[PDB]
Design a protein around this nucleic acid. Structure first.
Lengths: 104, 221, 136, 68
RNA sequence: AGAGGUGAAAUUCUUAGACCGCACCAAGACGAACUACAGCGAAGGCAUUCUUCAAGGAUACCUUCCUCAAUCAAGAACCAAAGUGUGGAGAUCGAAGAUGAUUAGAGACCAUUGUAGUCCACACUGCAAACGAUGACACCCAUGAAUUGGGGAUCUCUAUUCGCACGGGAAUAUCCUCAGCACACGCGAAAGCUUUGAGGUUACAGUCUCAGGGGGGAGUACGUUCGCAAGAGUGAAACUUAAAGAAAUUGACGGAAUGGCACCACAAGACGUGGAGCGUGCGGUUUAAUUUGACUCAACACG
């Protein structure tokens, strides 16, 4: 019926590609096209802050001017698996169009 | 229990490294027809370069070096270079969206007989003035990196012996030169050597190993 | 009684710990440089009586202590660490019983150094278990 | 003995569905010439709590709410 | 000495050593991150590197040619996934199948499996939400920041960083320009469209072509052409029906979210109401009559 988006939920305009190999969903397995799926890049700490003080204490080399490693992963979510996880939520019609991009 | 029949050993490193004997391990008693040594050969042993050298407070805690046991002398374990790595988390933090990453592989056969793969990774840079939202490289400049990065690693490591070759890799002399020459093509952010693993070992020759370790340190045990 | 290397007392013998923690369980596993040999293999389910809490973080804490019970016996003071997600195609996010292992180690008196992420990463993967629709 | 008597530094908030338990940051009560703080381990308390409560912890060194 | 897997389990694997940890070896698939409102392709589709073979667009040009063109019944080629044929391959996943759970029932959804298949060569099929649900060629059309090719100027804008060797180079900055994918008028039932039109249309005319004529029946029936088959193209009527449908609005509802608030709500939890003793009220059965209202909260010690 009504078009809900000028974009149809894709990064793909008409007269661009046409296919866009699909990817698996973190948490689900749903195949969705790499445009559709909601990506997030993460940079996560290995250890909770109060767990760092313990381990960062217990190490000869680590924890002074040198820090711990982190977990770096992209996450590509099915649009269902993304809403349920709340990484994205519905938004009022006026606000549907907002692009955060990366700025600072 | 099991720690009873076990024995201890320390793992020597080639003399070009600083800390020589970096590890403590185990093997069963000779135990009849079985022989402790024959099982101890081929065991890879790992390290972190900042642990192994006394160098690098500054940039290398991030390279893992690993060795294989090619001989067993006394209570020691004598090794040879097996591979060099870049740690999982160091390599995952180099990536950036909006830049191009440019990877190569180079196979060199050293003067010493070993043929080693070399995995290089170069990242494009935004310029000072750069008003644009992209670092992306034209693909004819990408392909004219890979030819240099090959021609240099072929030319420099092929006329060298592993003893001098490993020191080029662990002291990042290559990486310094591979940037110097490959910088004028594309502005490069970092160009690193991700993995070195040594594919073919020429032979086993005792003298070649012994003169690789120099003066071997004591291992009570 | 303890079986050590011959080492001037108080100096520390490094050994490696492979912490592989899925969402269904946790392994706390001590090996040596290579890893051709083990000292302690304890799973978060060896200390727990049910499959529900098999993976719980208070399970790993009780497992990682019994690794220090054994290491002090095997003469291993300090540990390098390798931490692992359930695997390459399935899930890259570490399980809840990770971090409850390390603390139960540092807080048990072990040294620590040079943690890494060993979780195997598919440059290119075979198909994941879920159907094209997903797990639903 | 098992009594390790800490202070509530603060009520780190209400936590949980019914209104009952409350997240709290605990300052281990015991003081020694080598003062052993945690310094702080978050806890969940059962029943009403207040700014200077003495909270003796029978199960020490558990990392609290984290997960849920 | 457990492992797996789940909401919790169990089917399944384990002292004949699984799970786990190192280094390898074998096979088949696959090309992560970089990866974008990016590029290329007529569409379908296309992601490692190196070599290699024919092409394709864009741009540059005071080359050549001189109407050779636009769109198209019939006709031809290509067409994702599944399918089909003969050989190969057989790692992962997995229609059918088997097993354990779930359930009032439940081969379903979930879990351990598993055949065809998924992959490749050579043939067929031509049946997509094959979508931008938007035919093709041409013209006119305002604005802001961007982006991918190529070119030009700076050598009023001229400037930055890198330094025989695939290099009198590479990228950037300012400005222009052609060509590509995109983020004011007017029109529209509205949603919305806009130099990437759904604009320039009752003030109706630039050209060609395809399809539609209330909803069903029905893409069915018969006929016929094509196909190994599955099926594809072409395609009615009898009969039935007063609406079906589109956009938008205000309510209502949600096992959607988001702030809140309630002891007729819960917590923590005090006192007994539930089923005998007995006060009536109601229902019932009874009898001439058991007069009668009011049946969730807002009916029943109430009239």
């Amino acid at each position: 019926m009504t078009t809900k988006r000028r974009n149809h939920g894709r990064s793909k305009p008409a007269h661009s590609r046409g296919r866009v190999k699909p990817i698996h969903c973190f948490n689900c397995g749903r195949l969705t096209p790499k445009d559709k799926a909601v990506g997030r890049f993460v940079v996560r700490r290995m250890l909770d802050a109060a767990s760092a003080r313990d381990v960062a204490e217990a190490s000869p080399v680590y924890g002074a001017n040198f820090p711990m490693p982190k977990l770096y992963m992209k996450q590509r979510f099915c649009i269902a698996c993304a809403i349920h996880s709340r990484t994205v939520r519905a938004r009022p019609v006026g606000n549907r169009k907002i692009r955060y991009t990366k700025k600072v | 229990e099991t720690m009873a029949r076990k024995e201890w050993y320390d793992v020597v490193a080639p003399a070009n490294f600083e800390k020589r004997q970096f590890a403590k391990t185990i093997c069963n008693k000779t135990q009849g027809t079985r022989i402790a040594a024959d099982v101890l050969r081929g065991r890879v042993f790992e390290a972190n370069l900042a642990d192994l050298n006394q160098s690098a407070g500054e940039e290398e805690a991030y390279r893992k070096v690993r060795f294989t046991v090619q001989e067993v002398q006394g209570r020691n374990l004598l090794t040879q270079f097996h591979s060099m790595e870049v740690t999982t988390d160091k390599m995952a933090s180099l990536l950036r969206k909006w830049c191009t990453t440019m990877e190569t592989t180079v196979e060199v056969k050293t003067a010493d007989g070993y043929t080693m793969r070399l995995f290089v990774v170069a990242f494009t840079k935004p310029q000072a003035n750069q008003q644009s939202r992209n670092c992306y490289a034209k693909q004819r400049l990408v392909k004219w990196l890979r030819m240099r990065i090959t021609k240099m690693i072929k030319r420099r490591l092929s006329k060298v012996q592993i003893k001098e070759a490993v020191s080029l890799l662990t002291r990042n002399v290559l990486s310094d030169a591979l940037v110097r020459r490959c910088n004028p093509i594309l502005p490069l952010r970092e160009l690193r050597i991700r993995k070195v693993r040594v594919v073919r070992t020429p032979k086993f020759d005792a003298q070649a190993l012994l003169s690789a370790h120099g003066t071997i340190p004591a291992s009570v045990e | 009684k303890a079986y050590g290397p011959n080492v001037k007392k108080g100096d520390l013998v490094y050994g490696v710990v492979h912490i592989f923690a899925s969402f269904n369980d946790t392994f706390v596993h001590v090996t040596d440089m290579s890893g051709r040999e083990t000292y302690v293999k304890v799973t978060g389910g060896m200390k727990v009586k049910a499959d529900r809490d098999e993976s719980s973080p208070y399970a790993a804490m009780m497992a990682a202590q019994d690794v220090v019970a054994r290491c002090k016996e095997c003469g291993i003071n300090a540990l390098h660490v390798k931490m692992r997600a359930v695997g390459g195609v399935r899930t890259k996010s570490p399980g809840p019983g990770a971090q409850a292992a390390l603390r139960a180690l540092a807080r048990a008196g072990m040294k620590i150094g040079r943690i890494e992420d060993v979780t195997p990463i598919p440059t290119d993967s075979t198909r994941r278990k879920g159907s094209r629709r997903g797990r639903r | 003995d098992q009594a390790q008597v800490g202070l509530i530094i603060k009520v780190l908030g209400r936590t949980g569905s019914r209104g009952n338990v409350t997240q709290v940051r605990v300052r281990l009560m015991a003081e020694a010439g080598s003062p052993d703080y945690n310094r702080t381990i978050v806890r969940n308390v059962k029943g009403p709590c207040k700014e200077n409560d003495m909270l003796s912890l029978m199960e020490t060194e558990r990392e609290a709410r984290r997960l849920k």
